[PDB]
């Protein structure tokens, strides 16, 4: 009865729309971006890992991060008031509470923001192919920052919210999971990479097929934000490409759906792949190759080559990257080429 | 007649030829057919190629133990370097094959045709009276194919380096490049990623929004696609209803409403961004590598405190060390 | 033309051809169910439950039949390795059999319901149009569900009337099928206490019976029926798919 | 389309604005400058001061090794730091 009085208030066309969804989207979103910005400049990753992760410590924009919690923590939620932190905020900061805090708040923040796309769309009366499209990123973040770790030993192995702290997550994958050799990541790429091509070939086709509807050169104005005739010529375009690549669009409605399917689909396959690496169910090797190379020492393919790189990445990295393991690899063990 | 040449020049320039062979195309056509044909054979059958300088031949072809994912056309030898090794410079095909002759033939040709392909992407526009610049958007990929196949080697001193024509050897080029240039830590690559990552992001947006504002012109039991007709008069969706929503998602002015201004931002973002990565590979080709923060954040006594930049480097060493295991005789990798 | 990815839309308002469809899916999943069983029985080696237990042999369905009580074969061997015991009919072969038969009946029933799709009981008496009262529909099903849920915990898991469940020791050295006793204490919420698996299906079963009648009796607030577009069968699909993926994420974790 | 509420272009240009903010902005700037300057930040976020990573020797990192008794562990870690 007042529900409405409220609904009315929330759905008021303000500068920054709000909505019921906003009662979730903003409490979290901010609270997450906030924690990052905090941890990034103030809190450390010394008791958790063993590195300086903030500005106050000496790190720069590239080398800072809100690094995951100690491995001994497990998959613990790390609630400020839980068994671990025991209510003490500062320690909470030291054990790595700021990570599950960002992870979880950001999580509900992406749930919130999608509901929004779904709330604003229902109101303004348009199809929801933008909350659907946004499922793609939910998949990525929900599988890379949540599922993956839940499959391993602790949270310690999830990306860490940092620029370099990610490049590390990249190499680790190449080194232990041999990701680049996974068909699912491959599709992932084929989609992000080709989604970029669509987002750039279409942009250029439109701009260089424009009818003249102005007098000057800066033809940006020639476009009446108001309805009517198409602004470029789909007919001319379809012609260009078809004679300069054999195939060419000719259904703006299909062109724009493809543009939604390509990049979205690829990030989905990208996800399924990682859901697999959570169980170390990777695509590490091709047995047919191994059996051959074991028997015949003169067989070498760019495949085998890369596998040695991995051995190296693990041997030299593991030690400082997995402190809770107390690894100790005597110089005589470290696999190495010649000279180097 | 009217002198065939006069006529020839008219066919070559036909504005209505299924596929527009142009003046540029007169080269693109044979060049790409030489490359494409040699590649396809090389990839199926072709002896192991002594890629590095030593005599440890790598086999990339299918008939020699590979599958589509591992196979590749291997780079001409290191003993060859930057020297021009065409077929006539070999004492026999076998020599040509063992030393990697196929690679040079294939890349010099692909780079030549892919360039004219860029030129062709202008000629046709002209012949069709349309605005140019499409060919300038395509200069990003080309620039990247140029970097990786020609610039990078001219810098390093040999085509033995420089991405090999094959799925897995492409991963090789990368995993090593990192260890040698710490690329992930180079501004130009990050802009490359913002471009490629961004590009996709917007491709989904544009494609998303538009699809979300198509004007009802079909039943429930028939494709939404039929609602459009090739060449149809006016627009096929409400560019105002579109902005009506997107504007409200973030906030009005944090949105588009000008198809021309919106579509340009689509072709400029990824192109400008991808150009950079090409400029990164082309830059790191002369050894101006990525950022280096190893042993910064040192503490009060002098103990090194290690930042993520170091775990990185730690994994980079592992790469640096094992790569090309039998090709080094001295301490520093200056090649 | 209807797109290929929509072909199955022709059922959004044909409760007969929908039930016919749904009858065929079930029938197939049973087929597969017993089907798998037989394949595994035709290749499972029972000769050594110490170093060559079912899980080493890539057994997927066999373990599920073990957990609930089916632990032997008409071939005289036991999954625990017991000298000539004797399942009733309910041996791995029996279970597989039952299923192969069920999928047979379901198949046939799936035809009857396809031909005879226009059944009075399917159309709104007030109109001449077909229609399904989902709210009462649900309440009836949830009633049965809970009724059955209760039964499973009460009689099966308890051994009150049926076998028990696979219960073992801390180090999987002595596992077997024993009857479990409910446990309402708080420990019954410990994922490792079988008694919790019993108490749950007994409580949630009753709580499921009660809730059913409710929906069987109480109608949906005007406001909500509008909100969650009830009456539109496709709102039930989104609601189930949401729970089915919830159930999933939970079985994957456990 | 529908353009509502107090505009920015104007507000930024408003003399009242700078009257108000040519106090607030630097206020915040100096307020936070002291947060670090005082060394308060350190203590709030258990972040080590350049002279507090390892006590003179212990080339070993103070790594939390177990939840539940995690805190007590960190405490003694600072203890040893003398």
């Amino acid at each position: 009865g007042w529900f409405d009085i409220l609904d009315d208030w929330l759905k008021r066309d303000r500068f920054v729309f709000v909505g019921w969804s906003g009662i979730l989207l903003f409490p979290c979103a901010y609270l997450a971006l906030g924690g990052w910005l905090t941890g990034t400049t103030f809190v450390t990753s010394w008791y958790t890992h063993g590195l300086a992760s903030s500005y106050l410590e000496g790190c720069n924009f590239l080398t800072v991060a809100v690094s995951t919690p100690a491995n001994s923590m497990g998959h613990s939620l790390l609630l400020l008031w839980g068994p671990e932190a025991q209510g003490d905020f500062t320690r909470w900061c030291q054990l790595g509470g700021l990570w599950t805090f960002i992870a979880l708040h950001g999580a509900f923040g992406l749930i919130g923001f999608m509901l929004r796309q779904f709330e604003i769309a229902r109101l303004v009366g348009v199809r929801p192919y933008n909350a659907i499209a946004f499922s793609a990123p939910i998949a990525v973040f929900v599988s890379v920052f949540l599922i993956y770790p839940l499959g391993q030993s602790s949270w310690f192995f999830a990306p860490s919210f940092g620029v370099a702290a990610i490049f590390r997550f990249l190499l680790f994958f190449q080194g232990f999971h041999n990701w680049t050799l996974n068909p699912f990541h491959m599709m992932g790429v084929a989609g992000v990479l080709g989604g970029a091509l669509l987002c750039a070939i279409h942009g250029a086709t439109v701009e260089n097929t424009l009818f003249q509807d102005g007098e000057g050169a800066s033809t940006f104005r020639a476009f009446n934000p108001t309805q009517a005739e198409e602004t470029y010529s789909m007919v001319t375009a379809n012609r260009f490409w078809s004679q300069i690549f054999g195939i060419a669009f000719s259904n703006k409605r299909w062109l724009h759906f493809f543009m939604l399917f390509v990049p979205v689909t690829g990030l989905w396959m990208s996800a399924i792949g990682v859901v697999g690496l959570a169980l170390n169910l990777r695509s590490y090797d091709f047995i047919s190759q191994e059996i051959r190379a074991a028997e015949d020492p003169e067989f070498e393919t760019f495949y085998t080559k890369n596998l040695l790189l991995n051995e190296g990445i693990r041997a030299w990295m593991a030690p400082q990257d997995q402190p809770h393991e107390n690894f100790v690899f005597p110089e005589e063990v470290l696999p190495r080429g010649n000279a180097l | 007649s009217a002198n065939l040449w006069e006529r020839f020049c008219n066919w070559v320039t036909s504005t209505d030829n299924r596929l527009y062979v142009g003046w540029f195309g007169v080269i693109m056509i044979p060049t790409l057919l030489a490359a494409t044909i040699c590649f396809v054979i090389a990839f199926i059958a072709a002896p192991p190629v002594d890629i590095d300088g030593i005599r440890e031949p790598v086999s990339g072809s299918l008939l020699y133990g590979n599958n589509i994912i591992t196979g590749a056309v291997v780079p001409s030898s290191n003993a060859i370097g930057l020297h021009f090794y065409p077929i006539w410079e070999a004492a026999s095909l076998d020599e040509w094959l063992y030393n990697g002759g196929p690679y040079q033939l294939i890349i010099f040709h692909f780079l030549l045709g892919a360039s004219c392909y860029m030129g062709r992407q202008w000629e046709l526009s002209y012949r069709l009276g349309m605005r140019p610049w499409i060919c300038v958007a395509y200069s990003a990929p080309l620039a990247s194919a140029f970097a990786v196949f020609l610039i990078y080697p001219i810098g390093q001193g040999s085509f033995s380096d420089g991405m090999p024509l094959g799925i897995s050897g492409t991963f090789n080029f990368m995993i090593v490049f990192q260890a040698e240039h710490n690329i992930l830590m180079h501004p130009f690559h990050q802009l490359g990623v913002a471009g490629v990552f961004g590009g996709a992001l917007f491709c989904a947006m544009h494609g998303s929004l538009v699809t979300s504002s198509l004007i009802r012109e079909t039943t429930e039991t028939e494709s939404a696609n039929y609602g459009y007709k090739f060449g149809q008069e006016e627009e096929t969706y409400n560019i105002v209803a579109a902005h009506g929503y997107f504007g409200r998602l973030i906030f009005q002015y944090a949105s588009f409403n000008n198809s021309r201004s919106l579509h340009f931002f689509l072709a400029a973002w990824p192109v400008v961004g991808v150009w950079f990565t090409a400029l990164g590979i082309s830059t790191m080709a002369f050894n101006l590598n990525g950022f280096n923060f190893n042993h910064s954040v040192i503490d009060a006594k002098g103990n090194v405190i290690n930042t993520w930049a170091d775990i990185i480097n730690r994994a980079n060493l592992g790469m640096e060390v094992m790569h090309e295991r039998n090709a080094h005789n001295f301490p520093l990798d200056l090649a | 033309g209807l797109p290929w990815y929509r072909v199955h839309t022709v059922l959004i308002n044909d409760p007969g051809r929908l039930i016919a469809a749904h009858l065929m899916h079930t029938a197939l999943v049973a087929g597969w169910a017993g089907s798998m069983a037989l394949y595994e029985l035709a290749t499972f080696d029972p000769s050594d439950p110490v170093l060559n237990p079912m899980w080493r042999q890539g057994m997927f369905v066999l373990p599920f039949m073990a957990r609930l009580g089916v632990t032997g074969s008409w071939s005289g061997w036991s999954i625990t390795g017991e000298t000539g015991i004797d399942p009733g009919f309910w041996s791995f072969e029996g279970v597989a059999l039952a299923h192969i038969v069920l999928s047979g009946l379901l198949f046939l029933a799936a035809c009857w319901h396809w031909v005879y799709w226009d059944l009075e009981l399917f159309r709104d008496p007030r109109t001449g149009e077909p229609a399904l009262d989902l709210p009462k529909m649900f309440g009836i099903h949830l009633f049965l569900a809970g009724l059955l849920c209760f039964g499973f915990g009460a009689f099966h898991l308890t051994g009150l009337f049926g076998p028990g469940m696979w219960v073992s020791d801390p180090y999987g050295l002595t596992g077997s099928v024993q009857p479990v006793a409910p446990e309402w204490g708080p420990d019954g919420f410990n994922p490792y206490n079988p008694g919790g698996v019993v108490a749950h299906h007994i409580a949630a079963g009753i709580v499921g019976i009660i809730a059913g009648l409710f929906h069987i009796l109480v109608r949906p607030p005007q406001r909500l029926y509008k909100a969650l577009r009830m009456g539109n069968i496709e709102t039930v699909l989104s609601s189930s798919i949401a729970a089915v993926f919830f159930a999933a994420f939970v079985v994957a974790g456990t | 389309g529908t353009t509502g509420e107090r505009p920015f272009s104007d507000i930024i240009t408003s003399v009242r604005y700078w009257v108000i903010h040519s106090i607030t902005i630097p206020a915040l700037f100096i307020a936070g400058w002291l947060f670090v300057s005082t060394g308060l930040a350190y203590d709030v976020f258990g972040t080590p001061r350049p002279d507090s990573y390892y006590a003179q020797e212990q080339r070993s990192i103070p790594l939390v090794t177990d939840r539940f008794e995690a805190k007590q562990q960190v405490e003694t870690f600072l203890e040893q730091l003398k």
Binding site: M114, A139 | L214 | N232, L237 | -
Partner: peptide, 30 residues
């Protein structure tokens, strides 16, 4: 994870059928 997409799709297709076939031709106040 694949059924989450099913949920978010059919769900959205329920609370949006009135537009499943395109926006209502001719509109304003957006």
């Amino acid at each position: 994870l694949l059924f989450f997409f099913g949920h978010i799709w059919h769900g959205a297709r329920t609370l949006f059928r009135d537009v499943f076939s395109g926006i209502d031709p001719e509109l304003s106040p957006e």
